[PDB]
Symmetry: C3
Subunit: 156 residues, 3 copies
């Protein structure tokens, strides 16, 4: 007989994953209102409390300005529709600057250094209606028919 | 008789106090020249030495872009005018990036993410004649008839 | 006879040397492509790999946008034409933010806070063609005949 060995590769990333350990910033004094936010999508700020100091954020909508991207944690999320989400009325981890893996709806690889446009629901699309100050970072992969892209986030 | 219990709340912040421990930067190689600086007020850079490296700073005036905000210290400052000031001819801490409490002369709470306008004397004002690239953070409180506001400082 | 004693002063900086310990950031997952890079000169990114993650960099030319500045490293560099360089097909340290000493071609001191103009070969020079978003940090010295200048670099 002939003995055999096989080789397999792991995936590269998952939605909401922190790409690199390069000069990042996460805001933890945030609270969620009006529904749920998927891990890996932009969020908007509706109010910053004057004295309490907590920032009220929710899912990105039309005619607004994004503030940050939710990140992945094994303790703060809940499991719904076979995916990790931040439920209403709970603390959220929002990255304001760094490098992150974001969900994508496009079909063509982006160009390094170009501006990123979002859709009305917070997922990256090549031709969007929301203009941001974030940038592409060149990462482009796919995990079990889920499109992921790499985004560099600057502080607003 | 009926027993009684009393409760009091501490004040939130003091002028020149650092707000959050999130990605700040302090320049300590500066020196005050020809004047005094109140903690929690903007400063201007007059001349940057080519070889020595020390930077001459003073109080902000009309027709000049600010550099940073002086912060508190129990060892570097001196006590004068019922306040905590930086005397002339001494090393001074200037915070260049981060979140800082600043003295203000306004009466209406600012909107999160808007531009910051300074006055001639170096204090925040709703209607200022000096343009600035800093932003608001939402903090808005008062400590015994002193108005304070939370400012996000970006590196020059 | 009577005795004597002397005094000498060391130079301030060297090309491609980190100016100080401010908030900086380096990139070490870059590879030099088709040529060599001088230590202390700007570089440009030609391509970023989609799945592998490396970044191909080269010397700056006309009609391109700068990305960073190479820095000194006694281990990863090679000696050529009596200088320190990064040879082709190897790793390279690229400083993407912070204060750095870099080579210059100008003849007079620069103005603090002014924008940086670069030449087609990647060295700082007044009235140059390429426009960047970096600033001058107030440093002007010569080392045994080479002209150096201190630059503040922000992330793209």
């Amino acid at each position: 007989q002939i003995n055999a060995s096989y080789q397999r590769d792991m995936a590269i990333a998952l939605p909401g994953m922190v790409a690199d350990t390069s000069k990042y910033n996460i805001d933890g004094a945030c609270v969620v209102n009006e529904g749920d936010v998927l891990v890996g999508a932009a969020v908007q700020v509706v109010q910053a409390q004057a004295v309490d100091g907590h920032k009220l954020v929710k899912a990105l909508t039309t005619g607004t300005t994004p503030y940050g991207v939710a990140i992945r944690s094994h303790w703060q999320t809940v499991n719904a529709q076979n995916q990790m989400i931040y439920e209403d009325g709970g603390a959220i981890n929002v990255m304001t600057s760094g490098r992150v893996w974001m969900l994508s709806k496009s079909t063509e690889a982006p160009t390094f250094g170009s501006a990123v446009k979002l859709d009305v629901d917070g997922q990256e699309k090549s031709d969007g209606t929301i203009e941001t100050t974030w940038t592409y970072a060149g990462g482009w992969t796919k995990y079990k028919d889920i499109q992921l892209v790499e985004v560099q986030l600057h502080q607003l």
